[PDB]
Design a protein around this ligand. Structure first.
Ligand code: GTP
Ligand code: GDP
Ligand code: GDP
Lengths: 428, 211, 433, 51, 52, 49, 428
């Protein structure tokens, strides 16, 4: 018996995981009121992986919501599926992060983790045998990085045998959204190193790339953007909710795709995707799904695989289909793109075939790849960090909020020591 | 030869330390030192592992082996203060906790300062014992707390010869396992004797009854 | 009187068994519920409680639920006594250790408990038909634990087994090689005959002889099951030349180690095709030695068939088999060995193959060629070279070491596995001297 | 928060103590069964020695 | 409160090593419970062979 | 099997009856307190007049 | 066939018992007019535990309400359940006590005590067999402490084989309502010690703590506070009135929870407490009932139970639940905090379920606890008394009303004389 507790940090993680809750509420038949209106018996069959029981059949999600600014809480309340969660899960504070990692970690946020952890703890003790936590956050800016890393570290000290799937919005190369992106990103991924097991990076530039070129949307808004990342957030945990052959769990994927305990940064993609007008012409089969998948335009992060080498890759398929098609396509992809795969790991693809398709589609499959293309993202934001840091700029409001030059140099040194193995394994 | 890389062994050792397999964590950190001699963070983690398992002399030696290169290294100072504290030198734990607090105002350094302050105040205070010039069952019952039944269950395991002859692991015969356990009990009871002495234990009842 | 405790350990088994048991039931009448709308063709694998409830004899175990849950809430909901389907909590997450060291002990006591009960209430425990997946977690982890803790009790009693050897070019678990090597390090000194099968082979066979243009697991399992049915006919239905479990072993495992035979069904002909073929004793026996009907991706046309055990099921005149055998012992290619002149082990059990409402057509004939080829070494070397590139830069090892196992094990395993190579090699050399 | 964390560590110690006592019970059962095994073994060794 | 917290923390610290020695002793005992009765039965087999 | 099914159906029926009981009391308590609030409010209104 | 006679002393006692009569009149089906409009036979089966009789279904409570000023009687009469009491049971006096313990114990209260005893004898003699007397008062202030403890002494002398429950509200740590609450509490407990068998201390600050962030109320009234007290007060006397397995009455609770004759001051708690916004989200079962029971929140006296090791715990459950789950959760909490219970009393848990829940819920549980945490409250009242008394302040209105220094010195001596064993038994 399996369960995952969902934790959301910052306005970014709050909105993204909120959209996740509408996505899996629609998948599991839960209305906004919290009761059940569905069709299949196989839909209550593992409802209490994300939805704790309550009296009268009013299923309640096992999520906690955290932010220093008590307005994203009201936005989540005023959203469509807002009145679904517990009201004591909405831990807030009367303060302002100001997009400071120091003010998310060494001030008021550190006084508020004392309460958010207790709420997490009640949700975790009201369980049978826990598997994972699922934190939604953004590495750029505060709160999601600031509180994010302290919640990361304290929950790992509490429960040391649980997978913590943390899904992080990384800063983009062309554009940027909170001036202190390099400091927060490097100084947060430093804590993401020795703590988590599955960190999935999602980049807004590749997000608009797949929204524009693939979906052919006219005016794509954050609702649709968080819908895409919430679909790839619901795609991974489907074999632990619905039956089917070749089931795959969080440790299944982590032990499969973490060759060394620090190279646990992955690249997601949900890929039965097509445009409202293309469907009529698009053909939907396993080979077409594989070809539309493994292409470097369905990647959720702005890191091209052509500048590196995959180590391991998983595809968690969903839907009724054959599997000689998927076996032949996986081996055909390995044989066709052979220079881009590592040689020290042979036969490095995963098929994980859930039977139940998503609603409105016939087949889907979530791509999760562990490339050496994360080297470009890491090296880019390391260069930006050094460019700010050599002049000691935008820094006095971390030194005055309680920090020193040495911890920043440790973070940059450890992240350069993240950048070394990803090129030693690309050079064998 | 040495087969994988230093940060991989470090993350392995941290994961085994979190899971509680302290011997395997210590072995992984020793392999990490064989990769790179003298990494202060790796000595600190290896000292923490021996501190947890109960080999205090090498936990100390790893603490100075972390601290000789940079005497301002906060994690190593904290580790050395912790290990000196649990060895019994509350005075040296107190001075190293003060050094760490002065170098960086951290909660753990502060906490260790009140630890050693309470430990010294309990034994000395101000009136204390009157001293003399000069030169078991109940005692260990109140030193060990509610662990006394575990204690005497361990010696009930000592007093059986088929329990002496064992074949656990390659050579880790269960007699030695029982020795490691009961030796941890003896060191912890001696530490409780230094933490709150027996004369402080009746000083509790003497600040009581007459009140 | 003559029973055989069945045991399915892991997704592989549970799934192939849903088929195995489906087939065993339709081989008698037991309607998916227990009742047998009207003889001794039941005690071999099914018990009987005064109630018409013909109860099965499995332990369908799996560290994780899901896989088993389906069986519990499926058309065969009843049959399996509601305590012969031992589930668990979490999954072995593809980690030999996880299921042979950590989250495996918690369930090991119960798994053997029901095997004990099963044993006690069985006149003659001829043997245990175990079913695992060499490449994977539970199928390797729990299997080691189980298979091993079965010799500590029912030792003399034989223990046959079916397993899906990590395929050559396909494979799905990136940590598959590791699991396999450690598991052939344990079984070797425990099992009695591991009829290792392979996915790639069956997959292809389904496309060239059954006209299935997209085979899935069900289909594959279906064949695997009919092979087990064949090995279990003498111990049930009657015939002319029967063969107990002890016989398939004292006539197919030359030395106390080379006990990993390969098998293949013969009349594997799609229904809408047989209408053109005479599927007779010859045809089937010949097609049984074909280089492209073997159920493991190996080239028998590159080894030396040490010893075979052709088990003909169905209506087979016992004078046409001798004919086929002869017309095969002259054919050069099929090269035998300089230490076994006698050919194979003829065996007939009148009882036409059953037709589980599916694909494989019916034929008044059939034969399952269980053979001990010296070529299997080729598939062993493959996974050994695979373990090699992996146990080189300590790849996916931190996961298996922080689960309870010691790096020493993966190493010790490699040694044993390499000795297995030496053996097959020596057994293949000649002895003109 | 200090009082909450203190109650934590107290309750963790209490669950630890009671499950330790359960371990002592299981160990005592195994010890008594294997002591009976020792008695039968010592007897049988005595007759094999004399014979 | 801080002193009581750290006091109880190191008490709980000792208690898991007590758990870690009890589990390994239980592992040894449950390993011997399997090779108990078979070696016993071989011993009476030795007895009856010695009688004959 | 038939008798066990009838027994569990009867237990579900009595559970539904108890639910209806507690809801109708919640209604009656609400009605009594709102009459009390009404008399207090009308007293206050005529006194301010 | 069993009865319990009810006494209300003071303004607080009158209000709190009026709400008690409202709640148990709702439980027993008596309308405002007094007639029985019932719907269960178990309801009328043992209605003669709190209600004497009349003609025409006019079941009249066996409560006799006293106060020293004739306005609270008018308020209780003007209340919603005002036309239910027998009108000459309103024992009033045309004066005012003035929050003076001497003016209730040795002055104008004493010339009304004779009439109160007359009417109490009138109510008690119309019975077949009695358990005793439950009396509600404020520990500080006059009337309920002035006339209160004298009334305790007179009925305890004239009926010497009866359990005497006393529901007392105690002065709070943060605030106070009369200056001489340290005098009144000390002088009242000095008589409460060697008279009563079961004194239940309920603190208003703990009531506010419960009502603010467990009930999530914003404008709490004294009606809600006495509603909580009436909930625990109806919960304690549940097996004398309603059936069930493992019944427990007043004497059974007294012998199971009073180990030593002076150690009879308790700490009550009632906790199916759900807020209005989160009642739909609750998961009502006996594990969460036990968790919210034993969490150091729902005890209505402001004593931290973690600062004193428990002596004895009882829980009287109301409703239909499995005593397997009840009994294993009470083992689980006894082993969850084991250093918070005395080790010289093994298995110090009393459980008692009854079939009928308080009508309007499904499951309920009243917790009563003998703890050593009452040492903080008694020590605090002792400190306030010593600070007041060392300077001889607010004392001349006791000396001129008929006292001496000796009475106050013996009152503080008895305060400390019960403060010594409640610390002595916390350390074996
Ligand atoms: N016939 C058949 N073979 C399967 C099936 N599922 C998996 N396999 C084979 O098993 C291999 C991986 O699955 P397993 O080894 O069985 O995994 P497992 O033993 O259940 O271990 P866990 O996944 O941790 O529970 C694949 O390479 C397949 O070849 C199935 O449903 N039917
Ligand atoms: N997918 C998605 N990303 C978002 C959304 N809103 C914000 N983001 C990302 O969140 C990042 C900034 O978040 P931040 O200001 O740190 O939030 P905070 O944690 O509350 O401080 C930006 O880079 C955005 O790309 C959304 O609705 N959907
Ligand atoms: N629970 C509850 N407590 C009350 C109520 N009314 C008063 N009190 C308490 O009674 C205490 C003071 O009452 P008191 O002065 O003794 O009234 P007096 O006896 O008439 O003088 C205050 O601390 C209040 O907390 C009520 O309606 N409910």
């Amino acid at each position: 018996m399996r369960e995952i507790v969902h934790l959301q940090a910052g306005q970014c993680g709050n909105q993204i995981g909120a959209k996740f809750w509408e996505v899996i509420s629609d998948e599991h038949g839960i209305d906004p009121t919290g009761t059940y209106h569905g069709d299949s018996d196989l839909q209550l069959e593992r409802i209490n992986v994300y939805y704790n029981e309550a009296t009268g059949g009013k299923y309640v999600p096992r999520a906690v919501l955290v932010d220093l600014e008590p307005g994203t809480m009201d936005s989540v309340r005023s959203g469509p599926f807002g009145q679904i969660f517990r009201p004591d899960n909405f831990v807030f504070g009367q303060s302002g992060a100001g997009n400071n990692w120091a003010k998310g970690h060494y001030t008021e946020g550190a006084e508020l983790v004392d309460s958010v952890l207790d709420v997490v703890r009640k949700e975790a003790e009201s369980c049978d045998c826990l598997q994972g936590f699922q934190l939604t956050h953004s590495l750029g800016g505060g709160t999601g990085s600031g509180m994010g890393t302290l919640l990361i570290s304290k929950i790992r000290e509490e429960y040391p045998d649980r997978i913590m799937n943390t899904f992080s919005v990384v800063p983009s190369p062309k554009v940027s959204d909170t001036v202190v992106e390099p400091y927060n990103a490097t100084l947060s991924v430093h804590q993401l190193v020795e703590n988590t097991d599955e960190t999935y990076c999602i980049d807004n530039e590749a997000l608009y790339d797949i929204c524009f070129r693939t979906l052919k949307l006219t005016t794509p808004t954050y609702g649709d953007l968080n819908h895409l990342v919430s679909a790839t957030m619901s795609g991974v945990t489907t074999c632990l909710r619905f039956p089917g052959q070749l089931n795959a769990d969080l440790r299944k994927l982590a032990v499969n795709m973490v060759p060394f305990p620090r190279l646990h940064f992955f690249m997601p993609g949900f890929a039965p995707l097509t445009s409202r007008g293309s469907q009529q012409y698009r053909a939907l089969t396993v080979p077409e799904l594989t070809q539309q998948m493994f292409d470097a335009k369905n990647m959720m992060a702005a890191c091209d695989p052509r500048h590196g080498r995959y180590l391991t890759v998983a595809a968690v398929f969903r839907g009724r289909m054959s599997m000689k098609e998927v076996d032949e396509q996986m081996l055909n992809v390995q044989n066709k793109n052979s220079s881009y795969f590592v040689e020290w790991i042979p036969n490095n693809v995963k098929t994980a075939v859930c039977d139940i398709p998503p609603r409105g589609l016939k087949m889907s499959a979530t791509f999760i790849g562990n490339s050496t293309a994360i080297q470009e993202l890491f090296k880019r934001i390391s260069e930006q960090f050094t460019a700010m840091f050599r002049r000691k700029a935008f820094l006095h409001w971390y030194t005055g909020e309680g920090m020193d030059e040495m911890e920043f140099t440790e973070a940059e040194s450890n992240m350069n020591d993240l950048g070394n193995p990803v090129v030693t394994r690309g050079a064998c | 030869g040495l087969r994988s890389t230093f940060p991989s062994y470090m993350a392995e050792g941290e994961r085994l330390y979190l899971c509680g397999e302290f011997a395997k964590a210590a072995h992984s950190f020793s392999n990490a030192l064989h990769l790179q001699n003298g990494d202060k963070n790796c000595l600190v983690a290896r000292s923490k592992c021996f501190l947890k398992m109960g080999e205090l002399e090498k936990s100390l030696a790893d603490a100075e082996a972390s601290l000789q290169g940079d005497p301002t290294f906060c994690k190593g100072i904290l580790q050395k203060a912790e290990t000196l504290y649990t060895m019994g030198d509350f005075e040296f734990a107190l001075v190293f906790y003060h050094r760490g607090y002065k170098l960086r105002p951290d909660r753990e350094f502060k906490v260790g300062i009140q630890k050693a302050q309470e430990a010294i105040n309990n034994s000395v205070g101000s009136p204390a014992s009157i001293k003399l010039e000069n030169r078991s069952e109940k005692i260990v019952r109140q030193l060990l707390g509610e662990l006394y039944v575990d204690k005497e269950y361990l010696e009930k395991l000592l007093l059986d010869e088929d329990l002496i002859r064992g074949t656990i692991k390659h050579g880790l015969t269960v007699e030695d396992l029982i020795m490691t356990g009961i030796n941890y009990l003896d060191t912890r009871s001696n530490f409780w004797r230094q933490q709150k002495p027996i004369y402080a234990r009746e000083r509790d009842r003497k600040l009581m009854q007459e009140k | 009187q003559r029973e055989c405790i069945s045991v399915h350990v892991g997704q592989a088994g549970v799934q192939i068994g849903n088929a195995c048991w489906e087939l065993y039931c339709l081989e008698h009448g037991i309607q998916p519920d227990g009742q047998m709308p009207s003889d001794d063709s039941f005690n071999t694998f099914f018990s009987e409680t005064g109630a018409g409830k013909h109860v099965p004899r499995a332990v369908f175990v799996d560290l994780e639920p899901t896989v088993i849950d389906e069986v519990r809430t499926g058309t065969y909901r009843q049959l399996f006594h509601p305590e012969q389907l031992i589930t668990g909590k979490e999954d072995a997450a593809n980690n030999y250790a996880r299921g042979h060291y950590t989250i495996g002990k918690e369930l090991i006591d119960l798994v053997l408990d029901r095997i004990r009960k099963l044993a006690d209430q069985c006149t003659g425990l001829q043997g245990f038909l175990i079913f695992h997946s060499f490449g994977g977690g539970t199928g390797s982890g729990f299997t080691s634990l189980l298979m091993e803790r079965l010799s500590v009790d029912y030792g003399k009693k034989s223990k046959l087994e079916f397993s899906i050897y990590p395929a050559p070019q396909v494979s799905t678990a990136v940590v598959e090689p590791y699991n396999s090597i450690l598991t052939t390090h344990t079984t070797l000194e425990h099992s009695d005959c591991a009829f290792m099968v392979d996915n790639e082979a069956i997959y292809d066979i389904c496309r060239r002889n059954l006209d299935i243009e997209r085979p899935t697991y069900t289909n594959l399992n279906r064949l695997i099951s009919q092979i087990v049915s064949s090995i279990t006919a003498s111990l049930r239905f009657d015939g002319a030349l029967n063969v107990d479990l002890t016989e398939f072993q004292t006539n197919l495992v030359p030395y106390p180690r080379i006990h990993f035979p390969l098998a293949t069904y013969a009349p594997v002909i799609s229904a809408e095709k047989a209408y053109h073929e005479q599927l007779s004793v010859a045809e089937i026996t010949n097609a049984c030695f074909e280089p492209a009907n073997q159920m493991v991706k190996c080239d028998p046309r590159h080894g030396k068939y040490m010893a075979c055990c052709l088990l003909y099921r169905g209506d087979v005149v016992p004078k046409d088999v001798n004919a086929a055998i002869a017309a095969i012992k002259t054919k050069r290619s099929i090269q035998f060995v300089d230490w076994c002149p006698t050919g194979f082990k003829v065996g007939i059990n009148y009882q036409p193959p059953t037709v589980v409402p599916g694909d494989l057509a019916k034929v008044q004939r059939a034969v399952c060629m269980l053979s001990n080829t010296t070529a299997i070494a080729e598939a062993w070397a493959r996974l050994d070279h695979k373990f090699d590139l992996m146990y080189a830069k300590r790849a996916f090892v931190h996961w298996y070491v922080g689960e309870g196992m010691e790096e020493g094990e993966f190493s010790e395993a490699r040694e044993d596995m390499a000795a297995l190579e030496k053996d097959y090699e020596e057994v293949g050399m000649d002895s003109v001297e | 928060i200090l009082e909450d964390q203190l109650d934590r560590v107290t309750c963790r110690f209490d669950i630890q103590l009671v499950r330790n006592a359960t371990l002592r019970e299981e160990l005592d059962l195994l010890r008594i069964e294997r002591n009976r095994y020792l008695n039968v073994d010592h007897k049988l060794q005595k007759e094999i020695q004399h014979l | 409160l801080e002193n009581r917290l750290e006091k109880a923390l190191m008490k709980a610290e000792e208690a898991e090593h007590i758990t870690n020695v009890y589990l390994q002793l239980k592992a040894y005992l449950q390993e011997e419970s399997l090779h108990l009765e078979n070696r016993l039965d071989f011993m009476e087999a030795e007895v009856v062979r010695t009688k004959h | 099997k038939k008798q066990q099914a009838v027994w569990r159906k009867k237990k579900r029926e009595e559970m539904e009856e108890e639910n209806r009981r507690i809801i109708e009391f919640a209604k009656m308590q609400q009605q009594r307190e709102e009459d009390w609030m009404a008399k207090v409010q009308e007293t206050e209104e005529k006194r301010l007049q």
